[PDB]
Amino acid sequence: ALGKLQDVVNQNAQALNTLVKQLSSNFGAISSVLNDILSRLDPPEAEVQ
Amino acid sequence: FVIRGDEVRQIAPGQTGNIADYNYKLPDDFTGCVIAWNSNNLDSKVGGN
C-alpha cells in the first residue's frame, strides 16, 4: 500500500550507502586509506596518490 | 655548495637522504634550476681534501 513512500526512503538510504561505500575504493591509488598513503610513500609520491 | 656525485640526485624537490634531510632541502613547489658539475680537478687532492 505504501510502495511510493517506502521507495523514496529506500532510494535515499541507498544513495547515502553508496556514497559512503565509495570512500573505500582505490580509484587507482595504492590504497583507499589516506593515512596509509601518507605513511608508506614520500610526500612527493604521496601527492599523486 | 659542493657534494659528491651520488648525492647530486639528493638535491631535488622533495628528495630525501642525508644531504636533503640535514644539509639542503628544496620545497615541494620549488621553481628553479639545479646545475651540478664535477669538480674533481678543483676540489680533490692526493691524500684527501
Swiss-Prot record, chain B:
Effect of residue 46 to P: In strain: Omicron/XBB.1.5, Omicron/EG.5.1
Region Integrin-binding motif, residue ranges: 4-6
Main function: Attaches the virion to the cell membrane by interacting with host receptor, initiating the infection. The major receptor is host ACE2. When S2/S2' has been cleaved, binding to the receptor triggers direct fusion at the cell membrane. When S2/S2' has not been cleaved, binding to the receptor results in internalization of the virus by endocytosis using host TFRC and GRM2 and leading to fusion of the virion membrane with the host endosomal membrane. Alternatively, may use NRP1/NRP2 and integrin as entry receptors.
Subunit structure: Binds to host ACE2. RBD also interacts with the N-linked glycan on 'Asn-90' of ACE2. Cleavage of S generates a polybasic C-terminal sequence on S1 that binds to host Neuropilin-1 (NRP1) and Neuropilin-2 (NRP2) receptors. Interacts with host integrin alpha-5/beta-1 (ITGA5:ITGB1) and with ACE2 in complex with integrin alpha-5/beta-1 (ITGA5:ITGB1). May interact via cytoplasmic c-terminus with M protein. May interact (via N-terminus) with host bilirubin and biliverdin, thereby preventing antibody binding to the SARS-CoV-2 spike NTD via an allosteric mechanism.
Name of the protein described by the UniProt record: Spike protein S1
Organism: Severe acute respiratory syndrome coronavirus 2 (2019-nCoV)
Lineage per the UniProt record: Viruses, Riboviria, Orthornavirae, Pisuviricota, Pisoniviricetes
